[PDB]
Ligand binder design. Structure first.
Ligand SMILES: [Mg+2]
Lengths: 217, 223
């Protein structure tokens, strides 16, 4: 297939280029198209016939082709431009081929996370398991460290993290960390704590609870 | 013009994947092409095949012996059959087609995730992530739903039947050591709203036909 850098980043209002490297037999001999893919959506065409914009696509987007490479340019970057970008062309059989995609990250100012912790519901405990969730909301940059402690024992290997796509409006990320215990294990300990480290925090933030403080509504 | 994929989410290894794409707003007999493109999780786009105006078909050479694309004019639909599937065929499958002029944008379906696996369907349990002082920061509260132990992907989550979108974060699922997926969806709201505003997460797991509307109510906490 075609080759693209895995990611690019820039601040709002700036310009970026994304370039697609191919060969004589695909880009060399054929028209190039470009597509935007917002998370969870189908690709949307930005450029076709190397440099033409479909109706509805603003002139912030431009394309060109030279030899066996092609380039997408985006000016006036907006938070809504966060997406994967793909080139596409045709091969020696005139079948469509695509690049691997380039993720565009929008830079913004450092933002510390707000941290929230959720004791497991009585409903779930009745089913035999305790999931303890720590939420880090609306932070930047994406790098963050979360450590779980249960009665001051550092947990290793029994939690899983998930991170959202970059927010289309404020360019932040959010992260969940979920610590899973059996009911019996959950009922052997008192203090459940998640400790969060992030560039935007001058010292780590800990959120904690004691088993037994809450009852379901 | 709108395109919409339909077909099973889970397919067993060695069986045949069957998808359909229903086309509305345009005659299937008037397309420049109708075709299929897939996207494995975390990877790029791969063309599968196309059917042209006459009915002539062209398939990806690495897939050719396993692919059939056909048109049903009475249903105004086209299809994909992919035989002898393996785990490597797990992907979001898009239908696409070109209408009206050669320079037009193609129309795309929404994409449908097909998982090829020997594991079986399992619907989720839905548990509340109920707000309390522990999920309050200043005048803001966080609440959510935990959608646990389902297979295969995906699940969709909305809040308040779509009326609540601001501040919602629905996390990518994680694959647990059990081989089942879980995810959470959270939202931040004014603490002042907890006593007056109802918050319901709407969960749909199409592969198991599981739909749940869960009201998330504040906990009674004395910390
Ligand atoms: Mg990505």
């Amino acid at each position: 297939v075609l080759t693209q850098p895995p990611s690019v980043s820039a601040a709002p209002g700036q310009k970026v280029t994304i370039s697609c490297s191919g060969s004589s037999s695909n880009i060399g001999n054929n028209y190039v198209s470009w597509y935007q893919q917002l998370p969870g959506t189908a690709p949307k065409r930005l450029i076709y016939d190397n440099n033409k914009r479909p109706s509805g696509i603003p002139d912030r987007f431009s394309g060109s082709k030279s030899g066996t490479s092609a380039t997408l340019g985006i000016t006036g970057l907006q938070t809504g431009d966060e997406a994967d970008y793909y080139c596409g062309t045709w091969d020696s059989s005139l079948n469509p081929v695509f690049g691997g995609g380039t993720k565009l990250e929008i830079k913004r100012t450092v933002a510390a996370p707000s941290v929230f912790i959720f004791p497991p519901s009585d409903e779930q405990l009745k089913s035999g398991t305790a999931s303890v969730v720590c939420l880090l909301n609306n932070f930047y940059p994406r790098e963050a460290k979360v450590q779980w402690k249960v009665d001051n024992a550092l947990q290793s290997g029994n939690s899983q993290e998930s991170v959202t796509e970059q927010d289309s409006k404020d360019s932040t990320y959010s992260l969940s960390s979920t610590l899973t215990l059996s009911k019996a294990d959950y009922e052997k300990h008192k203090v459940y704590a998640c400790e969060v480290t992030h560039q935007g925090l001058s010292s780590p933030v800990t959120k904690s609870f004691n088993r037994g403080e809450c009852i379901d509504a | 013009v709108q395109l919409q994929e339909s077909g099973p989410g889970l397919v067993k290894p060695s069986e045949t994947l069957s998808l359909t794409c229903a086309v509305s707003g345009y005659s299937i007999s008037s397309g420049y092409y109708w075709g299929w493109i897939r996207q494995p999780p975390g990877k790029g786009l791969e063309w599968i095949g196309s059917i042209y105006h006459s009915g002539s078909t062209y398939y990806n050479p690495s897939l050719k012996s396993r692919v059939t694309i056909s048109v049903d004019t009475s249903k105004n639909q086209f299809s994909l059959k992919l035989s002898s599937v393996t785990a490597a065929d797990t992907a979001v499958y898009y239908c696409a087609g070109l209408t009206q002029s050669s320079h037009n944008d193609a129309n795309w379906g929404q994409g449908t995730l097909v998982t090829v696996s020997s594991a079986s369907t399992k619907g989720p349990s839905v548990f509340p992530l109920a707000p309390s002082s522990k999920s309050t920061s200043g005048g803001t509260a966080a609440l959510g739903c935990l959608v646990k132990d389902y297979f295969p992907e995906p699940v969709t989550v909305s809040w308040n039947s779509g009326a609540l979108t601001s501040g919602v974060h629905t996390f990518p699922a994680v694959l647990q050591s059990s081989g089942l997926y879980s995810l959470s969806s959270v939202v931040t709201v004014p603490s002042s709203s907890l006593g007056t505003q109802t918050y319901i997460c709407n969960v749909n797991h199409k592969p198991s036909n599981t739909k749940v509307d869960k009201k998330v109510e504040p906990k009674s906490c004395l910390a």
